[PDB]
Design a protein around this ligand. Structure first.
Ligand code: F43
Ligand SMILES: C[C@@H](OP(=O)(O)O)[C@H](NC(=O)CCCCCCS)C(=O)O
Ligand SMILES: C[C@@H](OP(=O)(O)O)[C@H](NC(=O)CCCCCCS)C(=O)O
Ligand SMILES: O=S(=O)(O)CCS
Ligand SMILES: [K+]
Lengths: 262, 442, 548, 442
């Protein structure tokens, strides 16, 4: 079977498919050290061992469960590491990743995932060890524009707002600032707003023009939803199937006939 | 038989139990094991003698830090559990020959009381089992220790709590898997009122036996509510067969082939199997090359999708060994499945809708809680007609200790009391037994 | 030209509406706001009364006003106010709307009159009825009629309490005291009056409005009981009955059970409430409470006014307080009645429908639902895409989803005359909205959204129900903001399009056609705006019995 | 047998039916007629086809003067009642051999649907019968007339009313003698939820058969609530036997010998018979010469007192042929009986207390209504444990047309549907038959 990922005849639909397609490797646009990543996450200190929420799996005793033991636990779960989070706001002005886009990508590509989609934020809750592995890929690659992708665990207002004077997304807590000298976005706070001892340079914003090419949101002044008739058609098909299924009397007509038979 | 469908019943271990079984042999209306199970669910009562003794000693009456100073009563109840249990048997039974069963639990610190079906038969609803057991325990204790008339109402209060000032048994020291019908969200929701952690405790945290038990109760409830009537009946039977009872080993094999996979890979496997079996076919191709699929058999497609759903739950939550992701898993399994194919999701969107609210209310301030406390009579998770809650049961089997409201905290005593009942603990193998007993009688 | 453009221009004065960039962090935070400065001053003055217990403090948690804090225009009005003035706790008009609905009960009089004549041998005339109506306008607000040494309620506290009467019997209506009559022929246009009477027949009903101070002290479940007690006392008084005989029990049973029309029904235990609380008020019932239908022939206008009232009732008060509480859900609601935004979308949909199908021009089919819903949703989405200050206005996805889908759903109903087609269109709009923006609403916004298509036309147990009779207790709908207010609009929409006098119940429609109500139900928008400006006088204040 | 008590069973006509019967042979736990009666009450549903058709035609949906203009549906439902009933049978049954019973009433104006016990057995409570019948009728109508998808939800609404916006079937066009358990006053009160006028309609205004049915339902309910457990069981059995089933012709003879008498003279007769039978004895004499009596057998005295109570109701209400005096009669029978003897009244004051409130709420402004609308699940008349409501049933049989809320106005349709069922209509003769069937197997 060859997976389709999503319907649509425009580049926006294609960008979504590439995000979900596990054989597509994300283009790496920047470098972020493990320490800076851990620092921005704001859960622990670089250098300390992972903290547990329960004993390691082998130190616990389980009754036999064939089905359970057929599923490979992720490393963080093997070691009983606590669950932590990372959370993004994605500007509606063509941020390279978008909320349901993220969720669908994660559920195709990552294991042991808890992800919540909202209009103003998108969150992953994962074993901290595995969270850090995942998060690196989420901030180093094309899934992350330092200008239009905000890391924020609270006070998330901004995805729907106009960009600021330097083209950066609003952040009421200003966890990042614009470095005028280098033209870089620099994080001076962790994702919940605690000031960092040493700020973290996230590099240059992507161009407006680059975002238009790679974004996963439909916009009228770029590629309008109205132009993707294939996508609309399949959405309506899903809606219709649900409606007829709910009503039931026609799609289950053969089932009813037998119940009425004899 | 009414329907033409035949199925193979496979155990939780992936091995064949019973071959070539007509679908109706696992119907709640025909299967004798399911009948016995439902009967036991309604008539079985847990009595906490240690709780009664402790409550009386402190005058801790009515629960929630209620104390009534000066009304304390000191009685060696647990010490005399056998004598009390025998008197309760005499008061609860209708004859020496009936199916009354009393069993000491945790060496008499607790008691399992199973009220005879004869009493249930001439009662309107199921509250009779608690009500009669309650009266029996009260009189057994008063008679055993010759409690003074002015102290006696403290014993009643210790057993049955605040009732009748409260509409239910608030602060009581007895319980039943079903709560009072006066607390039901919807008409006929009695069997939906069992928290997922109770299901897990009852099945001793065995994954597929938990999802099976939950599915049996949910789908049987769908018969009670009239949802599994006429046009819809076959959908609910197939749902029970495939998602609940691992029909044709589909569930066991989706998990097996995705042991190191994702929700996405489970979907791919499921869709492929559905195309292979003629459950689903291409209706048309779109300009991108995207193929839009349509069901060849709507009830059967729903059953397949529902099976992939439980498999995806086991794979993604099992990978995390953290149950919080079950709501997220149920939501995006369906979301991704629909856009992968153009097909309607499980229960035509209702499993997904449920997961949306389930996600919200297990990650926010407004209500809900951890996934283990949800059930079919919950305002948040009532909306799918039997296809969502089995995922929750499976997920809590797989949690290795990430929850505050864990199975032991919420459901420990409940597990000890009811897991002895073999049909509760190992439903899959025993339902298959029942299917074999009736397949030729259809 | 877009209907929201005027408001956007004033809300974002001196700013280029096409520019995707702006300035932040430059307003002095909360001190930019007159209302927040007022709040801070009162909080400081409160320290003394509170004996030092900490209180409102803008420096706790988030520093509000890093962006510019918006004013809002109540749609159809000239009122521009800060959002705080639209909070239900801060708006006496919203409070009085809820209380006016809550304190209203309708009771049939024919059964009581049959008891009087058949069991008690008393003759009923227009004169005895006029005497009865005078008696109950003394008894209902707490005056004694039978017993010696009764203490009584201070009339100054209950001036809003009264009883009126309406009847389908024009000859009887002509003979009743006009001071206590709700005149159907006067209050409704001729064709609507005829439609109402064709359902009502020559039956007679009284409308009892219990004192506001009573429902504030107590609850909604008090109302039908308070009504029934004083109906009983008034019959005993006006007709000189034995003050306590067997036939009296028939009055009570009629007034409390058999012949009573309540505003709302009881809740299940998990969210337990008595009758006449907002959760029990079905969408079509609320549509009938709102009175815009009899003063306007514009179906969009009638629906929009219903949605404004419903936003205040269902999201701000019911979901934002009764079922949650705290800062609450003001702007989840105001999105549906400010800045003429929803208006633009709805009037676009209506014109589209009128040109292509005609108003009530076609049978409902899935083809029609798909066509209209898709078109209107696309248009509504493109507006947020075309105007950056609009998106910054409806900054929450839930707001945008509700407003777009409301336009989609109402338009569908406008074309087909079918409310269930309407909500099916609503759900299509939502999942289409989701694919376009790769987002929808808050964490649990689309529970009912995803369940919606399948249950919209279902016929099963707790799924199938004609939309007009659905309400906040319909299971899929029991929890979440950004749906219920709009559902009230969709319930109204096909009946507005048809020019119907009512949606679900003619008696409820007539019962609120009354100028002596404090809240103006002919225009919820105008009353709410007056409350926002603190120009609305509510009932039930206690100044007469407390120190100055 | 457990108890030594023996009784002769007499008919409503005062003639011997069955001699030397052990008391337990009329127990709800043993008697096969009562079991069948309770089963039929739970599984039987009245479907009003004319109502459905009429509601649909005007879009009169949800009851209480609700109309939804533009959503009218015109269907010839009553005309096609036979075809619809057959489809309902197909959808409701579990096999062609089960005890499913469908019957047309008034030439298809209504349908009596009796749901198979198989469905009841695997459901938690009794709401299943209405829920399943409702779904069957909805689908039967939609299928028969090919109702348009957008009109179909109007049919659902016409059948089941406002549910689920309402917690119950408000404005529905089907009904069951028992209401939804979510509206019960007390736990286990299901069988108490039948207004007295319905009982009269069901028994076609025959005095003793009405009080018998009422007694059977009330005392069976007392087993469901657990009140008839242990120490209390015999009290409720004797209550049923003597007050409900005219044991030893005591009830019949009290009325006969006081045909031209008062409540006072019935009391004199009763006390004489109780002293004569050694049920009660003089404990001591007071200075005036007043004798204070004592029970020799408390449960049996209560049964005797309860029988005189019903006799006094029949005599006093029968003399007036106006039911309003029933509340007063129950009150002063007990009041006078106690001061006549120093003995405790029926149900140890609870029949009297119930009558005090019953009097108030049938003569005042605060609530209640006429005597015909009261039942055991009513807040006013719930308090006596089975001994008061049979008097109310008897009284409404004797009313010659003084009530506004008469049997005809409240219960006319109920008579048409349920009064054919023989165990309902003539409970006394059939309970005795059941007693004969099991008396030797005890
Ligand atoms: C119409 C009733 C029947 C009924 O259902 N309730 C009534 C009337 C009701 C009304 C009287 C209002 C009015 O007069 O306009 C109210 C105030 C309840 C209400 N609707 O607000 C009331 N009684 Ni009543 N009712 C009372 C009482 C009483 C006493 C009065 C006996 C005497 O000798 O005066 C008697 C009952 C009895 O005899 O025991 C009584 C009966 C009655 N009570 C008789 C009228 C008797 C008459 O014709 O005068 N009430 C009382 O006993 C004191 C408390 C007093 C209540 C007012 C208060 O608490 O302030 C009032 C409680
Ligand atoms: C779910 C339930 O909460 P519990 O799970 O019972 O704590 C329910 N709350 C709600 O539904 C909150 C509704 C309003 C707040 C959310 C609006 S999106 C209630 O309080 O009864
Ligand atoms: C009986 C019952 O009334 P209904 O019979 O249900 O109309 C009940 N009223 C009351 O209990 C009245 C209590 C206060 C008035 C009497 C004070 S003595 C109630 O309104 O729910
Ligand atoms: O963030 S949540 O969706 O949980 C609540 C929004 S009010
Ligand atoms: K603040």
């Amino acid at each position: 079977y060859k997976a389709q990922y999503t319907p649509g005849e425009t580049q926006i639909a294609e960008n979504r498919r590439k995000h979900m397609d596990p054989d597509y490797e994300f283009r790496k646009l920047r470098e972020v050290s493990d320490e800076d990543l851990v620092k921005v996450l704001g859960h622990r200190n670089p250098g300390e061992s992972y903290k547990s929420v329960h004993p390691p799996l082998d130190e616990m005793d389980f009754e036999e469960d064939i089905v359970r033991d057929m599923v490979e636990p992720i490393q963080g779960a093997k070691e009983g590491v606590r669950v932590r989070y990372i959370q993004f706001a994605d500007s509606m002005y063509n941020a390279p990743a978008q909320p349901y886009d993220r969720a669908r990508t994660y559920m195709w590509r990552y294991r042991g995932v808890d992800t919540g989609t909202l209009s103003g934020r998108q969150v992953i809750e994962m074993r901290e060890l595995d969270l850090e592995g995942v998060s690196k890929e989420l901030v180093e690659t094309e899934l992350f524009d330092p200008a239009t992708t905000g890391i924020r665990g609270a006070t998330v207002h901004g995805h729907s707002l106009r960009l600021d004077e330097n083209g950066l997304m609003f952040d009421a807590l200003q966890r990042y600032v614009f470095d005028e000298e280098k033209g870089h976005v620099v994080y001076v706070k962790d994702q919940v707003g605690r000031p960092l001892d040493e700020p973290v340079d996230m590099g240059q914003p992507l161009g407006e023009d680059e975002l238009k090419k790679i974004t996963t949101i439909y916009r009228k002044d770029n590629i309008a939803m109205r132009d993707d008739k294939e996508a609309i058609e399949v959405v309506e098909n899903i809606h219709t199937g649900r409606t007829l299924g709910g009503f039931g009397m026609d799609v289950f007509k053969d089932d009813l006939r037998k119940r009425l038979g004899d | 038989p009414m329907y033409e469908d035949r199925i193979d019943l496979y155990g939780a271990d992936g091995k064949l139990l019973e071959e070539d079984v007509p679908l109706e042999a696992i119907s709640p209306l025909k299967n004798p094991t399911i009948a016995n199970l439902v009967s036991d669910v309604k008539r079985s009562v847990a009595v906490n003698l240690a709780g009664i003794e402790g409550s009386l000693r402190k005058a801790a009456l009515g629960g929630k830090s209620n104390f009534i100073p000066g009304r304390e009563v000191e009685l060696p109840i647990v010490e005399n559990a056998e004598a009390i249990a025998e008197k309760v048997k005499k008061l609860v039974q209708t004859s020496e020959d009936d199916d009354t069963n009393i069993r000491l639990i945790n060496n008499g610190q607790q008691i399992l009381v199973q009220v005879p079906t004869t009493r249930m038969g001439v009662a309107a609803d199921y509250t009779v089992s608690a009500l009669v057991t309650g009266a029996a325990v009260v009189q057994a204790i008063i008679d055993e220790f010759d409690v003074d008339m002015f102290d006696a109402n403290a014993v009643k209060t210790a057993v049955m709590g605040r009732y009748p000032q409260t509409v239910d048994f608030t602060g009581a020291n007895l319980s039943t898997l079903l709560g009072p019908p006066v607390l039901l969200e919807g008409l006929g929701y009695g069997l939906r009122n069992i928290m997922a952690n109770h299901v897990v405790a009852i099945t001793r945290k065995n994954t597929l036996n938990a999802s099976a038990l939950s599915s049996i109760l949910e789908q049987t409830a769908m018969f009670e509510t009239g949802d599994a009537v006429g046009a819809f009946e076959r959908m609910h039977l197939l749902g029970l067969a495939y998602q609940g009872l691992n029909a044709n080993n589909l569930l066991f094999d989706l998990v097996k082939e995705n042991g190191k996979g994702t929700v996405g890979t489970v979907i791919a496997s499921l869709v492929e199997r559905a195309v292979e079996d003629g459950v689903v076919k291409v209706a048309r191709e779109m300009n991108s090359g995207y193929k839009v699929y349509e069901p060849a058999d709507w009830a059967l497609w729903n059953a397949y999708a529902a099976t992939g759903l439980l498999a995806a739950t086991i794979v993604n939550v099992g990978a995390a060994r953290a149950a919080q992701g079950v709501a997220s898993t149920v939501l995006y399994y369906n979301d991704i499945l629909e856009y992968e194919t153009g097909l309607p999701g499980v229960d035509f969107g209702r499993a997904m809708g449920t997961a949306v609210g389930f996600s919200f209310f297990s990650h926010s301030i407004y209500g809900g809680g951890g996934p283990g406390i949800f059930h079919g009579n919950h305002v948040v998770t009532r909306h799918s007609k039997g296809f969502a809650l089995p995922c929750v049961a499976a997920a809590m089997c797989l949690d290795a200790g990430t929850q505050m409201f864990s199975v032991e905290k919420t459901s420990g005593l409940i597990g000890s009391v009811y897991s002895e009942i073999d049909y509760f603990r190992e439903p899959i193998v025993n339902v298959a037994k029942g299917a074999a007993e009736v397949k030729d009688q259809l | 030209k877009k209907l929201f453009l005027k408001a956007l221009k004033k809300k974002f004065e001196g700013e280029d509406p096409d520019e995707k960039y702006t300035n932040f962090y430059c307003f002095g935070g909360w001190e930019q706001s007159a209302r927040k400065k007022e709040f801070t001053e009162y909080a400081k003055k409160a320290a003394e009364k509170r004996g030092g217990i900490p209180f409102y403090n803008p420096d706790i948690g988030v520093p509000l006003g890093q962006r510019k804090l918006m004013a809002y225009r109540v749609s159809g009005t000239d009122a521009y106010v800060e959002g705080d003035d639209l909070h239900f706790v801060n708006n006496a008009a919203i409070q009085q709307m809820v209380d006016d609905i809550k304190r209203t009960v309708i009771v049939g009089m024919d059964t009581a009159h049959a008891v009087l004549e058949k069991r008690l041998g008393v003759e009923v005339t227009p004169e005895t009825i006029n005497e009865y109506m005078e008696a109950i306008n003394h008894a209902l607000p707490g005056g004694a009629v039978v017993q010696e040494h009764m203490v009584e309620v201070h009339p100054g506290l209950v001036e809003d309490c009264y009883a009126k009467i309406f009847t389908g019997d024009d000859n009887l209506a002509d003979e009743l005291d006009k001071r206590i009559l709700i005149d159907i022929n006067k209050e409704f246009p001729e064709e609507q009056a005829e439609q109402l009477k064709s359902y009502i027949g020559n039956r007679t009903y009284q409308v009892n409005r219990v004192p506001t101070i009573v429902v504030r002290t107590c609850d909604g479940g008090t109302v039908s009981r308070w009504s029934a007690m004083q109906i009983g006392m008034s019959f005993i008084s006006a007709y000189k009955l034995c003050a306590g005989e067997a036939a009296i029990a028939d009055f009570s049973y009629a007034a409390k059970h058999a012949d009573v029309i309540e505003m709302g029904t009881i809740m299940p235990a998990r969210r337990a409430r008595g009758p006449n609380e907002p959760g029990g008020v079905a969408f079509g019932t609320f549509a009938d409470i709102v009175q815009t239908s009899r003063v306007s022939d514009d179906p969009a206008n009638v629906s929009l006014e219903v949605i404004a009232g419903a936003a205040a009732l269902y999201d701000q008060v019911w979901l934002g307080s009764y079922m949650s509480g705290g800062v609450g859900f003001t702007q989840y609601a105001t999105a549906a009645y400010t800045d003429d935004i929803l208006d633009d979308f709805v009037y676009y949909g209506m014109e589209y429908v009128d040109d292509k199908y005609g108003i009530c021009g076609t049978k409902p089919t899935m083809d029609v639902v798909r066509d209209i819903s898709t078109e209107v949703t696309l248009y509504s989405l493109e507006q947020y895409e075309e105007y950056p200050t609009l998106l910054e206005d409806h900054f929450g996805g839930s707001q945008r989803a509700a407003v777009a889908a409301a336009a989609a759903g109402c338009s569908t109903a406008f074309a087909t005359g079918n409310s269930n087609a309407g909500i099916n269109g609503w759900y299509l709009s939502q999942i289409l909205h989701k694919e376009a923006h790769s987002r929808l609403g808050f964490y649990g916004y689309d529970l009912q959204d995803q369940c919606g298509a399948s249950n919209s036309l279902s016929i099963r147990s707790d799924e199938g129900l004609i939309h007009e009779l659905r309400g906040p207790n319909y299971p899929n709908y029991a929890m979440n903001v950004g749906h219920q207010p709009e559902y009230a609009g969709i319930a109204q929409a096909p009946h507005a399009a048809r020019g119907d006098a009512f949606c679900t119940n003619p008696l409820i429609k007539v019962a609120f056609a009354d100028k002596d109500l404090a809240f103006d139900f002919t225009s919820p928008r105008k009353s709410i705006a007056a409350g926002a400006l603190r120009e609305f006088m509510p009932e039930g204040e206690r100044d007469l019995i407390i120190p100055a």
